[PDB]
Amino acid sequence: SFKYESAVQYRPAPDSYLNPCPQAGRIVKETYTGINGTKSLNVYLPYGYDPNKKYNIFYLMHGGGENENTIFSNDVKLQNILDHAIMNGELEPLIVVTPTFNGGNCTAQNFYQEFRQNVIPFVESKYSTYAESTTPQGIAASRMHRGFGGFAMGGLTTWYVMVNCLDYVAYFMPLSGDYWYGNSPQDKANSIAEAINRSGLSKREYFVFAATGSEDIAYANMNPQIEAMKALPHFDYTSDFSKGNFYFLVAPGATHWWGYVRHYIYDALPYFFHELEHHHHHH
Numbered sequence: 001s002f003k004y005e006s007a008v009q010y011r012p013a014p015d016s017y018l019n020p021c022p023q024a025g026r027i028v029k030e031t032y033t034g035i036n037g038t039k040s041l042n043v044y045l046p047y048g049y050d051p052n053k054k055y056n057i058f059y060l061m062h063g064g065g066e067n068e069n070t071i072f073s074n075d076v077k078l079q080n081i082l083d084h085a086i087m088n089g090e091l092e093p094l095i096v097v098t099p100t101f102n103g104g105n106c107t108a109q110n111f112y113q114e115f116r117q118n119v120i121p122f123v124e125s126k127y128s129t130y131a132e133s134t135t136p137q138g139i140a141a142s143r144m145h146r147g148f149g150g151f152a153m154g155g156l157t158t159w160y161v162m163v164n165c166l167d168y169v170a171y172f173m174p175l176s177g178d179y180w181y182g183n184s185p186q187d188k189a190n191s192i193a194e195a196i197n198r199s200g201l202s203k204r205e206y207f208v209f210a211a212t213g214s215e216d217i218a219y220a221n222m223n224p225q226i227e228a229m230k231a232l233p234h235f236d237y238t239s240d241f242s243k244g245n246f247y248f249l250v251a252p253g254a255t256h257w258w259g260y261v262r263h264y265i266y267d268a269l270p271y272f273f274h275e276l277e278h279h280h281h282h283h
């Protein structure tokens with residue numbers, strides 16, 4: 001059913017999507033040991049999950065003061081939105097992982113290292129993504145079907161993941177957080193451009209769908225960064241990812257709160273993972 005729009009507008013999921021869906025994906029609490037010690041995450045598997053099929057995977061980071069359980073807690077209930085959207089055909093089934101930047105030496109800034117070395121191999125060796133194996137080569141070869149996003153400090157995590165993990169991840173969803181690398185917006189954009197240059201990727205091989213609220217403090221620093229990025233040849237601004245690769249959704253009146261941010265995921269996540277996808281779809 002999904003069709004790309006060129007300037008998608010903010011629309012909250014219906015209130016009914018916040019209540020439990022009978023077609024509920026399974027949420028599995030996992031514990032693993034990596035460079036930052038023994039840590040946990042949650043894995044959302046779509047309803048009907050079949051390990052002999054291959055699923056898109058989206059990693060989603062919490063904000064400051066939160067943890068790996070926040071996004072699927074009663075304070076957010078993202079799984080209800082996912083369940084309803086997948087059941088209604090709005091969102092193709094995918095795996096959603098909620099890790100944490102807490103623990104050991106880990107920070108929102110440096111999480112990408114643990115992500116690369118420990119999180120991807122742990123999750124993707126257990127569950128069925130497009131990664132045929134979880135060697136660096138197997139992960140890189142499946143990058144078009146892997147995404148990363150996050151809220152606030154988790155948005156910062158997302159930007160650091162982008163600049164350090166373009167080889168492994170093609171889709172990025174920074175929510176209400178800017179990239180802290182640089183003394184000006186131009187420095188931030190230039191850093192991203194340099195990462196893209198180093199990666200060798202074409203503009204059809206990475207995608208950024210940023211979002212925030214018009215009354216969300218993150219707008220103050222996101223907006224200048226987005227404008228600087230728009231000026232780069234590396235980005236073609238439009239939400240139609242069949243045509244371009246960069247969009248910034250600003251929700252009128254929304255404030256810095258998961259109550260709103262969950263809806264940004266509802267609006268944006270359906271836009272991910274169709275470019276170079278393996279099914280024959282018309283979007």
Ligand SMILES: COc1cc(/C=C/C(=O)O)ccc1O
Binds near residue numbers: 064155178218221
């Ligand atoms: C990474 O960018 C941002 C982070 C925050 C974090 C707020 C908090 O932890 O309370 C707020 C605005 C931002 O633009």
